[PDB]
Enzyme design. Structure first.
Site, PDB file in Angstrom:
ATOM      1  N   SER A  14     -16.632 -28.183 -31.057  1.00  0.00           N
ATOM      2  CA  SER A  14     -15.896 -29.088 -31.957  1.00  0.00           C
ATOM      3  C   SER A  14     -15.301 -30.261 -31.219  1.00  0.00           C
ATOM      4  O   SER A  14     -14.862 -30.110 -30.072  1.00  0.00           O
ATOM      5  CB  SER A  14     -14.778 -28.324 -32.667  1.00  0.00           C
ATOM      6  N   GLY A  25     -16.128 -24.086 -30.285  1.00  0.00           N
ATOM      7  CA  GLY A  25     -15.848 -24.531 -28.921  1.00  0.00           C
ATOM      8  C   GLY A  25     -16.523 -25.861 -28.637  1.00  0.00           C
ATOM      9  O   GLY A  25     -16.088 -26.596 -27.752  1.00  0.00           O
ATOM     10  N   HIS A  56      -9.139 -31.269 -36.521  1.00  0.00           N
ATOM     11  CA  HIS A  56      -8.965 -29.797 -36.604  1.00  0.00           C
ATOM     12  C   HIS A  56      -8.629 -29.108 -35.279  1.00  0.00           C
ATOM     13  O   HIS A  56      -8.079 -28.013 -35.289  1.00  0.00           O
ATOM     14  CB  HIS A  56     -10.117 -29.064 -37.312  1.00  0.00           C
ATOM     15  N   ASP A  70     -12.257 -35.393 -40.349  1.00  0.00           N
ATOM     16  CA  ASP A  70     -12.133 -34.595 -39.096  1.00  0.00           C
ATOM     17  C   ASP A  70     -12.349 -35.499 -37.896  1.00  0.00           C
ATOM     18  O   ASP A  70     -13.396 -35.472 -37.240  1.00  0.00           O
ATOM     19  CB  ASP A  70     -13.112 -33.394 -39.085  1.00  0.00           C
TER      20      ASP A  70
END
Ligand SMILES: COC(=O)Nc1cccc2ccc(C(=N)N)cc12
Length: 246
Positions: free
Chosen positions: A198, A196, A46, A97
């Site tokens: 991630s 942030g 992502h 992800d």
């Protein structure tokens, strides 16, 4: 990271700081990552899906601050940006992800292990820590949901793993969270990962070994009651990691 503590790269040496170069030369922070082998950083698809151009990215290892060139840090470009082919995003849930970034210095070299740059072990198949285990998260993500700026200094916190059955409860995420995802949170809902953070690591000590159990993926709000952080469960993706790093 909401709450927790400020840290330095020497405490989290597998942590990779990923940035994007924009037209005009401005550089902005994108996501965190983890060094799994000298040439390979693992993160979340992502973070890159909307700008899937490897040339746009800058990766730092051994970096403690968002805008300081930490002594001993190493700068890299992305030789190969591998996104998971079956990635998708629902209103909340992000699927598959996971992304791999093959890194290379301007001289063509991979990371050189040091006191501030180290790899993090991958988990073994069907062996994730039990629910209730304390794990650490690291990142340059928001300190408060309402902030727009990210903290200048690297932060860390400790959260507890939550079972699939608990995370699938109606007041939690219901059927939105799958068996390929791992939930983790503070029982008091005071500390968590946030936007942030991630792509960054969820590291668990298992059988005495520090292991990359998860990758920060998604969550409803930050440190919100009954809304755990959701992480890509790395153990499920071992065949994909092995196949894409060969
Ligand atoms: C205020 O809501 C958010 O910023 N949520 C989030 C946005 C982007 C990624 C996130 C990753 C984890 C979490 C979380 N609650 N641990 C929350 C995230």
């Amino acid at each position: 990271i909401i709450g927790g503590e400020f840290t330095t790269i020497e405490n989290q040496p597998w942590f990779a700081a990923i940035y994007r170069r924009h037209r005009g030369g401005s550089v902005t922070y994108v996501c965190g990552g983890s060094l799994i082998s000298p040439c390979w950083v693992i993160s979340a698809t992502h973070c890159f899906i909307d700008y899937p151009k490897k040339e746009d990215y800058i990766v730092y290892l051994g970096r403690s601050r968002l805008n300081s060139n930490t002594q001993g840090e190493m700068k890299f470009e992305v030789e190969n940006l591998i996104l998971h082919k079956d990635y998708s995003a629902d209103t909340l849930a992000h699927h598959n992800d996971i992304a791999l970034l093959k890194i290379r210095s301007k001289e063509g070299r991979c990371a050189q292990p040091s006191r501030t740059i180290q790899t993090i072990a991958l988990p073994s198949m069907y062996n994730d820590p039990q629910f209730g285990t304390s794990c650490e998260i690291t990142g340059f993500g928001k300190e408060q949901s309402t902030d727009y700026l990210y903290p200048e200094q690297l932060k860390m916190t400790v959260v507890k793993l939550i079972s699939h059955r608990e995370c699938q409860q109606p007041h939690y995420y219901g059927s939105e969270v799958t068996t390929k995802m791992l939930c983790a949170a503070d029982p008091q809902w005071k500390t968590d990962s946030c936007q942030g953070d991630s792509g960054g690591p969820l590291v668990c000590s298992l059988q005495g070994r520090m292991t990359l159990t998860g990758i920060v993926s998604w969550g409803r709000g930050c440190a919100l009651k009954d809304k755990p952080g959701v992480y890509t469960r790395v153990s499920h993706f071992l065949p994909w990691i092995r196949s894409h790093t060969k």
